Design a protein around this ligand. Structure first.
Ligand SMILES: Nc1ncnc2c1ncn2[C@@H]1O[C@H](COP(=O)(O)CP(=O)(O)OP(=O)(O)O)[C@@H](O)[C@H]1O
Ligand SMILES: Nc1ncnc2c1ncn2[C@@H]1O[C@H](COP(=O)(O)CP(=O)(O)OP(=O)(O)O)[C@@H](O)[C@H]1O
Ligand SMILES: [Mg+2]
Ligand SMILES: [Mg+2]
Lengths: 430, 430
RNA sequence: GGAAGUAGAUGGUUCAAGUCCAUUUACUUCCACC
RNA sequence: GGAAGUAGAUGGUUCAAGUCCAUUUACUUCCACC
């Protein structure tokens, strides 16, 4: 293992030229910011030298007096960000900031309140300067351990707390390194994590809770792992077990429509997608909506007895796809409806008063009716469901589905940019 | 209602010529029996004049000393029966008797023990002479009420306690008339019977029990309605409710393969039969076995996710048919198998060590595997099931299935003598 | 023959079976055939 | 935007809904976007 981690360091540590680029970009930022007479602080991974090789982003925090309105922070912050970056983008879900580039390096310029105590925070980002002060004199010397953890997580698709990933944030990685001492110790101990593991770095303690909870040393009410999904927690624990069993440098490194067609026909399942235009909204808004829409349709498919197996979704540049595989390609038109016990004649009368095609029957002490379905395939079902229940499939996703959707299968489906997702959904290997 | 019951009397009461035939057959039996110096007693419906018009059978009971072996009763009883009847058949499940004809009338000649007290009975039939003594001076004058109840039950397929029917015995009908006073009172009160109704004629009482129970005034441990099915009890109660709501003389009176084909295709269901040679055994042995075989296959169909709707069975002269209708004509080859929670690595290791086609996955905190079915249709499934599980489908039925069976559907099935059963199974009306 | 129960022994399946699919011994009832 | 909760109002389905499919008002958190 020790030999592998040596090799892995070459993948996670920035070389002298990349470090040089960062420092020069930092120096230029300070120069631009000092010219404006702005109050700022460097925070995050650049300021701690815990950033992953090839993935540098400098965080500059603009410190505003607590009295300022939320609207002043965005106006003033966006104004400063734009004046200070070579090129810029402004795109966010709630908390305002400017993304840009200085001397080839990515930068976020972020307005925040200058608080004493990261308690009753005023903006969403107010803890961040306190994270830095806390980590400052604790992370020193353990930089490459953090970089190993980040690289391990990134190579396995579970790095980042954003909705798209629902994984481990960079800050969480730093806290784990402070807690365990090193990447290897983190990985060894994570093998024994449960869905009820509470890690409290400030108290130097692991206990049991209602949920997986890593308490922010800056804010004991804050779960740093709040947005780590159960399944992704499960993935990391499993990965840690595998790595220790058979340590591989491959842990640190990240089909033709014809074969996919044959696999689907081998499975004998109904495979299809709902396709609609992607709403022009940020990822952090879009993905939870794609998750909701996918779940609502899945649940419809289950209560309709199509026996859905799994679901998946994918957003391309212009379209979104909700993907489903079902055990039932076609169900009978007739089904049975449960009626009352033979005993209560009031409800039996009412149950039998319905005009039906097929004459109700007594079985095991109760009345039952044959009834007719409006659809017999999972595709016909989803068409009905998505057309009438658009409004429950996410604010923007539901509105887009209301404007246009189509259900795709077969040769037509395997031509869509969804092949990676389909393979993962069906556990296709090789 | 009173007018209908007047008309109905003409259907249930034997005319003077049929009564005359019975009396002459009785006189001839006595003459044949007296010539042999045999000890006998007339019992049952002929002896009480409670027999249904057109359905006369005389019961002659041979009274043997209690000390006699079971084998002497059969040998001696069969010997006497044969000497005394014009023609005869000997066919029974357990308790020996001879069926025959004297002067055009059906007769059962039955050996029984001459007990004091119908307690700790020695043969299955030992209560019968006591039933007669009990009913003798209680049923007098209410003969036609009994005949109305018998006729009502017979016209609706629930007369007789034998396994083929699982309904109301003639003796049960007599007890109900003694309890309620008349057919109309029986029918009025039966509307309020439940699956827990206990009727105790000897005590003049209705109470609540664990099950529907009519206590034999001759034997308080005996449930006269022991073999009345829950569903047939339910049928009678419902029928009683209908009759009182809309009294009809029709209550007392008992499809082309092409239309049936269209109905099945309208339903979109899988309809098929298991066909095998009828074992050469009595009804009372056969029917419970047909019931078992039908249930075992149904249960297989349910746990295999073919969503069976109902089942039915029919014995012809030479074949037996087990009939099934399923919502699922074809299921996918792939299905999901539930594995362990991500937490216990011992069981996860073992779950993942199985060589599979399709790579297991984590969902909601636990491992799942894709697995492949050996069959994809309910017919393929039953073929597999009946070929390997013949031994659990009844002693004789299972052995016959082991020798030969076939699964039939479509045009081929609608040509079998099973159309009545199929219509009833699917609630076909008109 | 079928059903219910009591005690015991097994095979298969399954990550895991007293708990699912089956096999089997002993004992106790009960039902249908009147 | 998404999630959880507290209180209230509705439509549909159903023999029967506080209990299923949905709609909606007020209030309390929480998460992602750093
Ligand atoms: N979801 C979240 N939870 C907790 N803290 C967060 C956070 N997002 C941002 N932060 C804080 O803001 C700092 C900067 O965040 P980012 O720039 O998004 C990532 P980073 O921690 O610098 O590491 P990375 O660039 O190596 O991924 C973090 O170090 C952390 O203090
Ligand atoms: N399953 C059963 N339960 C209770 N008593 C039964 C019985 N089978 C037969 N008996 C007794 O034996 C008598 C003769 O029975 P069966 O001849 O089979 C019918 P029955 O009662 O004479 O009426 P039926 O000929 O109008 O149907 C009955 O009257 C009853 O006393
Ligand atoms: Mg950064
Ligand atoms: Mg008779």
């Amino acid at each position: 293992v020790e030999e592998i981690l040596e090799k892995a360091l070459e993948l996670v540590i920035p070389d002298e030229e990349e470090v040089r680029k960062g420092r020069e970009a930092e120096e230029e930022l300070r120069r631009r910011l000092d010219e404006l007479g702005v109050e700022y602080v460097f925070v995050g991974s650049y300021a701690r030298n815990t950033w992953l090789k090839g993935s540098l982003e400098i965080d500059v925090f603009l410190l505003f007096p607590e009295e300022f309105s939320k609207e002043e922070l965005r106006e003033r912050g966006l104004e400063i960000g734009k004046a200070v970056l070579d090129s810029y983008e402004i795109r966010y879900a709630e908390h305002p900031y400017v993304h840009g580039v200085v001397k080839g390096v990515e930068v976020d310029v972020v307005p925040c309140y200058k608080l004493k105590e990261p308690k009753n925070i005023k903006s969403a980002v107010d803890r961040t300067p306190f994270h830095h002060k806390w980590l400052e004199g604790r992370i020193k010397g353990k930089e490459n351990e953090v970089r190993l953890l980040k690289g391990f997580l990134k190579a396995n698709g579970i790095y980042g707390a954003e909705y798209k990933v629902r994984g481990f944030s960079g800050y969480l990685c730093e806290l784990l390194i402070v807690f365990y001492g090193s990447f290897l110790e983190t990985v060894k101990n994570a093998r024994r994590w449960t869905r009820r593991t509470v890690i409290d770095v400030a108290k130097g303690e692991v206990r049991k809770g209602e949920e997986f909870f890593v308490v922010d040393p800056v804010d004991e009410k804050r779960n740093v792992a709040a947005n780590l999904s159960l399944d992704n927690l499960a993935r990391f624990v499993h990965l840690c077990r595998e790595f220790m069993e058979a340590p591989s440098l491959g842990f640190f490194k990240p089909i033709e429509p014809e074969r996919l067609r044959k696999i689907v026909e081998e499975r004998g399942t109904a495979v299809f997608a709902v396709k609609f235009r992607k709403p022009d909204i940020v990822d952090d808004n879009l993905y939870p909506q794609l998750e909701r829409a996918s779940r609502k349709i899945f649940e419809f498919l289950e209560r309709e007895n199509f026996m859905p197996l799994r679901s998946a979704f994918k957003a391309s540049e212009e379209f979104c796809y909700l993907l489903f595989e079902c055990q039932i390609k076609e169900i009978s038109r007739v089904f049975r409806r449960m009626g009352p016990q033979f005993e209560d004649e009031r409800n039996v009368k009412k149950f039998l008063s319905r005009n039906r095609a097929f004459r109700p029957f007594i079985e095991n002490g109760r009345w039952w009716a044959f009834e007719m379905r409006k659809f017999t395939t999972p595709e016909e079902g989803v068409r009905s469901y998505a057309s009438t229940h658009w409004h429950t499939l996410g604010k923007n996703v539901g509105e887009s589905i209301r404007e246009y959707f189509e259900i795709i299968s077969g040769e037509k489906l395997f031509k869509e940019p969804v092949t990676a997702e389909l393979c993962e959904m069906m556990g296709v290997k090789d």
